[PDB]
Amino acid sequence: YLMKILTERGYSFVTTAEREIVRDIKEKLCYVALDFENEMATAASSSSLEKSYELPDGQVITIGNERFRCPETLFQPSFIGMESAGIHETTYNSIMKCDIDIRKDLYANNVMSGGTTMYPGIADRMQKEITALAPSTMKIKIIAPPERKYSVWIGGSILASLSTFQQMWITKQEYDEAGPSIVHRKCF
């Protein structure tokens, strides 16, 4: 979608190998939109969004509305016609399949990790969009650390130390006898 955007920015001048580089501009300068309708009203009316970027042989470009426009599709996969709602809404539905008691507890216990979770404007949008879903009287915990991306790697590095965790390391020696034919019932 963001590629399908900035072709509009005169780019008869784009490649396969540069999604990896759009992604860079994004990681440098994109942010999660805060108030999308009014974000668009502002984008339609202010130059203040617009900021420069630079290209390998000594070439500037400038960008600013695209920089939140594509960063709304998380709340609107429905932009493409994707059946997903805005994702925490889409998700909140499956939570509705469940116990009532949990709900303030899990609101007071929500946890974030992976690369793209780490964008600016995220939580200060999201809590207020999750607020658009929820029942009344909630209080929240948004466990979204710096390097939350790597926090999942580092938690496996701790887990590995647990003596309890070691207590059925699955060997080549099982497999040497077993072959493949029921490893999926050494699994559940």
Query: 96 burial class (0-12, 13-18, 19+ CB within 10 angstroms)?
Result: exposed
Which DSSP helix (H) or strand (E) runs through 128?
Answer: helix 122-130
CB of residue 128 to another protein, shortest distance in Å: 38
Q: How far apart are CA 63 and CA 52, in angstroms?
A: 6
Shortest separation between residue 180's beta carbon and another protein, angstroms: 14
Q: What angle do CA 52, 56, 61 make, to 5 degrees?
A: 20
C-beta of 41 vs 159, nearer to another protein: 159
Q: Which is nearer to another protein, 139 or 184 (CB)?
A: 184
Closest distance of CB 134 from another protein, Å: 31
Report how far residue 160's alpha carbon sits from residue 169's, in angstroms, rounded to the nearest whole number: 11
**Which of 98, 143 has the CB closer to another protein?**
98
Hey, is 156 helix, strand or coil? Answer: helix
Summarize as ranges the residues that interact with another protein (CB under 8 A): 182, 185-188
Task: Give me the least distance between CB of 183 and another protein, in Å please.
Answer: 11
Nearer to another protein, 20 or 176 (CB): 176
Take residue 5 and report the two structure tokens written for it.
Answer: 């955007």
